[PDB]
């Protein structure tokens, strides 16, 4: 199945998990760190995996995204279809806090606390390769 790219509406960045372990966006679609494999725990719960490094997308306990080496609870995201047909990805562990995966206009991480419903920052188009 897949992989996909996640294209953010905000500045038109593909979500990227760098070998650093840092997360950001790049506009370069032939970047090798933007190819992402999504898998499902339960219905509407995904892990998001870099296929180049095998890292998982994760959000830490204060709202910053990082690449994780293992699929732990900080790696579960709620994928929710929005209008239409972008998805948003809410941190499952901090779901009560409305912490989304987000990129800023310049393609760097938005911090979970700085996110909220209705921002372009949180909208991602999954493009199956
Ligand atoms: C269309 O949507 C957005 O609005 C733009 C804007 O507000 O001029 C732009 O916002 C970025 O800059 C503004 C001020 O210049 C910041 O207030 C905003 O950050 S904040 O979200 O922390 O409050 C910032 N958004 S960011 O790039 O996501 O950090 C931006 O293109 C759009 O922001 S949105 O919230 O995703 O809708």
Curated annotation (Swiss-Prot):
Keyword Nucleus: yes
Tissues in which the UniProt entry reports expression: Predominantly expressed in kidney and brain. Detected at much lower levels in heart and skeletal muscle.
Consequence when changing residue 111 to E: Reduced integrin-binding. Defective in integrin-, heparin- and FGFR1-binding, and defective in inducing FGF1 signaling, cell proliferation and cell migration
A single GO BP: anatomical structure morphogenesis
One GO cellular component term noted in the UniProt record for this chain: nucleus
Record protein name field: Fibroblast growth factor 1
Binding site for heparin: 10
Gene: FGF1
Molecular functions per Gene Ontology: fibroblast growth factor receptor binding; growth factor activity; heparin binding; integrin binding; S100 protein binding
Organism: Homo sapiens
Post-translational modification, as annotated: In the nucleus, phosphorylated by PKC/PRKCD.
Record note on what altering residue 91 to A does: Decrease in LRRC59-binding
Intrachain S-S bonds: none
Keyword entries, A-Z: Acetylation, Angiogenesis, Cytoplasm, Developmental protein, Differentiation, Growth factor, Heparin-binding, Mitogen, Nucleus, Phosphoprotein, Secreted
Region listing for Heparin-binding, in residue ranges: 104-120
Effect the entry attributes to changing residue 104 to E: Reduced integrin-binding. Defective in integrin-, heparin- and FGFR1-binding, and defective in inducing FGF1 signaling, cell proliferation and cell migration
Functional note: Plays an important role in the regulation of cell survival, cell division, angiogenesis, cell differentiation and cell migration. Functions as a potent mitogen in vitro. Acts as a ligand for FGFR1 and integrins. Binds to FGFR1 in the presence of heparin leading to FGFR1 dimerization and activation via sequential autophosphorylation on tyrosine residues which act as docking sites for interacting proteins, leading to the activation of several signaling cascades. Binds to integrin ITGAV:ITGB3.
Family: Belongs to the heparin-binding growth factors family.
Known partners and oligomeric status: Monomer. Homodimer. Interacts with FGFR1, FGFR2, FGFR3 and FGFR4. Affinity between fibroblast growth factors (FGFs) and their receptors is increased by heparan sulfate glycosaminoglycans that function as coreceptors. Found in a complex with FGFBP1, FGF1 and FGF2. Interacts with FGFBP1. Part of a Cu(2+)-dependent multiprotein aggregate containing FGF1, S100A13 and SYT1. Interacts with SYT1. Interacts with S100A13. Interacts with LRRC59. Interacts with CSNKA, CSNKB and FIBP. While binding with LRRC59, CSNKA and FIBP seem mutually exclusive, CSNKB and FIBP may cooperatively interact with FGF1.
Chain positions of motif Nuclear localization signal: 1-4
Residue numbers of the full-length protein present here: 24 to 152 of 155
Lineage: Eukaryota, Metazoa, Chordata, Craniata, Vertebrata
Effect the entry attributes to changing residue 27 to E: Dominant-negative mutant. Defective in integrin-binding and in ternary complex formation with integrin and FGFR1. No effect on heparin- and FGFR1-binding. Defective in inducing FGF1 signaling, cell proliferation and cell migration
Localization annotation: Secreted; Cytoplasm; Cytoplasm, Cell cortex; Cytoplasm, Cytosol
Metal-binding is among the record's keywords: no
